[PDB]
Design a binder for this molecule. Structure first.
Ligand SMILES: Nc1ncnc2c1ncn2[C@@H]1O[C@H](COP(=O)(O)OP(=O)(O)O)[C@@H](O)[C@H]1O
Ligand SMILES: Nc1ccn([C@@H]2O[C@H](COP(=O)(O)O)[C@@H](O)[C@H]2O)c(=O)n1
Ligand SMILES: [Mg+2]
Length: 194
């Protein structure tokens, strides 16, 4: 008769590994709320806050924005959606992200696991150049794309390694057709009781 705290699943994977694509399917079939941290950041810069032109520059360069900004945006969205569960997509991307989540949120949510989509960089590059023909995203060009790989490699893989220490990573290989990947995603969420 108390309201349950939201379940949260971090969704990680390289740029273009299919996080946003698979999250939309989970929203559709499970009724979770999909929060793409990168999306929220693109919105925050959209209508031009203080932090707006900082976010533009860092996104173009594949850099991780200060966590005070990102975690605030996530927390606001989450607080606006009482009684829902959340797919937190593309976060945490480094140790600062994770610590700031822990400090702001751990009292408020049950973060269940990291869903990690494993994909070859070569395949990710091709998807992103394809997405780049119509996305109008400032980071879907080869210069940005390789900077995004280095950030993922240097900062993000350590976070995924951290969660795997505690058995909190579910890996779904993503180098297949989108329905073959989703079949596995949908089976995973069902087996996890969602
Ligand atoms: N399994 C897949 N096979 C081929 N294309 C895919 C697959 N998953 C997603 N895509 C395409 O790859 C691009 C990147 O997908 P997206 O979900 O935006 O990635 P992410 O959020 O991980 O950066 C999009 O054009 C998307 O339609
Ligand atoms: N936790 C996060 C998530 C996204 N980002 C920024 O948004 C950019 C785009 O992220 P997405 O590909 O997940 O939309 C990232 O490359 C990075 O510059 C961030 O700075 N912090
Ligand atoms: Mg995305």
């Amino acid at each position: 008769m108390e309201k349950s705290k939201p379940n949260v699943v971090f969704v990680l994977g390289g740029p273009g590994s299919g996080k946003g694509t698979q999250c939309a399917n989970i929203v559709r079939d499970f009724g979770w709320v999909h929060l793409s941290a990168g999306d929220l950041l693109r919105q925050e810069q959209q209508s031009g806050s203080k932090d707006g032109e900082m976010i533009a520059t860092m996104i173009k360069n594949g850099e991780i924005v200060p966590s005070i900004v990102t975690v605030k945006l996530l927390k606001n969205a989450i607080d606006a959606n009482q009684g829902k569960n959340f797919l937190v997509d593309g976060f945490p991307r480094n140790e600062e992200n994770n610590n700031s989540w822990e400090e702001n949120m751990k009292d408020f949510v049950d973060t269940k696991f990291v869903l990690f989509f494993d994909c070859p960089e070569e395949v990710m590059t091709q998807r992103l150049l394809k997405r780049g023909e119509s996305s109008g995203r400032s980071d879907d060009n080869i210069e940005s794309i390789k900077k995004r790989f280095n950030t993922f490699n240097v900062q993000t893989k350590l976070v995924i390694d951290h969660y795997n220490k505690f058995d909190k990573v579910k890996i779904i290989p993503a180098n297949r057709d989108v329905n073959e990947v989703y079949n596995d995603v949908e089976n995973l969420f069902k087996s996890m009781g969602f």
